[PDB]
Amino acid sequence: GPLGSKRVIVIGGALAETAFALGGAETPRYRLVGADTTCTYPDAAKRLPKVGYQRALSAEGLLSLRPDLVLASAEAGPPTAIAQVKGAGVTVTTFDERHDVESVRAKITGVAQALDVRDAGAALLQRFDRDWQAARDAVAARVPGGAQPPRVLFVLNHTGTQALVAGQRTAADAMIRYAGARNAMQGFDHYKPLTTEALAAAAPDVVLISDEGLAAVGGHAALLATPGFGATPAGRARRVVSLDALFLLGFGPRLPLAVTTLHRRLSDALA
Ligand SMILES: [Cl-]
């Protein structure tokens, strides 16, 4: 349009991945100029000046980068910061997050629409869909452990000796199920502090944690010494899988690889 090339800011790591996956840092139609701190992939994202954590944005910092457009994840906030950006006349297009493959496909087509690169969107979607079918095939070939879907506990983080764990309506729950496994935690949504009682009942076969969470707790031995973890199937077998948080949980264009990778890791762990 008459605005020419647009300066774009992206909030949400998977959105940034989507943008970069359509055709690099700057194209004829747009240039990415800023992001929130969760946008660490690929190297071009990591390079962008950052304007706060995605839930604690600096509206002033963001506006100082003179955006024409902001692509914002469902998690972008707080509301007063978003409102200040819109009030300065900047277009803010917000995406949904449903933690499923269709929701990623909507990010692909939605971001490509917002950036006026329909053809690039369609090409990326076709690649993504081919890769997704392959990932489905890889998972379907063999259940990790070779029997019924194994029980996996996802730890986000710890406060002291207490782990914060994923129930339903989470990225982790969806990823565990895409990889042919079952969430060891059932009966609640979102994240909740894990009680040793809930943990004994959950009886995980594998503990899954992000690289960041593993570092925060002090490593593998530290994690397994968390109260209650030893006396579980995973603890007895010392069965831990780590993956990078953005890659594991982001629900972006690497979803097929992320699911293949989680399934490989769980499969190795349950050899
Ligand atoms: Cl791997």
Side-chain angles (χ1 to χ4, degrees):
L3 290 164
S5 174
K6 292 189 173 158
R7 293 174 62 80
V8 180
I9 293 174
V10 183
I11 312 304
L15 289 187
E17 290 195 40
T18 300
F20 283 108
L22 295 161
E26 44 181 309
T27 73
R29 315 270 325 103
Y30 60 86
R31 298 163 282 114
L32 307 153
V33 304
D36 73 294
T37 61
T38 66
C39 300
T40 63
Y41 196 88
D43 287 343
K46 189 179 294 106
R47 285 203 287 282
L48 293 172
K50 307 303 199 293
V51 292
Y53 172 66
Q54 100 190 117
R55 302 204 83 236
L57 293 172
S58 171
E60 306 102 286
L62 189 162
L63 292 165
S64 80
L65 301 176
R66 304 178 292 102
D68 297 314
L69 173 63
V70 173
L71 308 173
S73 68
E75 300 97 344
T80 42
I82 296 298
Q84 189 177 343
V85 171
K86 285 181 188 164
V90 179
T91 299
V92 174
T93 301
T94 302
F95 292 81
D96 298 301
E97 178 61 79
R98 315 210 179 246
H99 304 130
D100 69 16
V101 62
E102 193 66 66
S103 180
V104 177
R105 298 175 83 239
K107 291 177 200 185
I108 293 168
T109 60
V111 166
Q113 172 63 211
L115 295 179
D116 189 31
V117 290
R118 150 189 90 82
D119 283 356
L124 178 53
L125 186 67
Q126 177 187 70
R127 299 202 301 280
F128 178 94
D129 286 350
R130 182 169 62 241
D131 292 343
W132 183 239
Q133 182 65 61
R136 286 295 209 179
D137 290 350
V139 172
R142 201 177 298 268
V143 182
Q148 289 139 278
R151 304 181 72 82
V152 178
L153 175 68
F154 182 73
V155 174
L156 182 57
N157 66 48
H158 284 74
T159 299
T161 62
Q162 195 161 227
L164 187 76
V165 300
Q168 284 66 71
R169 296 188 183 240
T170 60
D173 184 86
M175 293 296 293
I176 284 166
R177 288 181 287 117
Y178 284 139
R182 196 177 181 167
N183 192 347
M185 306 310 299
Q186 295 293 329
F188 63 97
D189 296 338
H190 314 305
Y191 284 98
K192 131 207 304 292
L194 181 68
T195 60
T196 66
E197 164 172 37
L199 176 55
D205 306 314
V206 184
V207 178
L208 181 63
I209 190 170
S210 68
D211 297 354
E212 296 87 339
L214 184 59
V217 74
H220 296 88
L223 179 61
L224 288 171
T226 297
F229 280 55
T232 62
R236 292 172 181 119
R238 307 192 69 84
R239 206 173 283 133
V240 177
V241 170
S242 61
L243 193 64
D244 171 83
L246 174 63
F247 179 37
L248 176 59
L249 301 168
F251 273 86
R254 295 183 293 162
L255 183 69
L257 184 62
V259 169
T260 300
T261 301
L262 181 55
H263 174 261
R264 177 194 292 110
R265 300 190 181 198
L266 289 180
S267 297
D268 281 354
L270 294 161

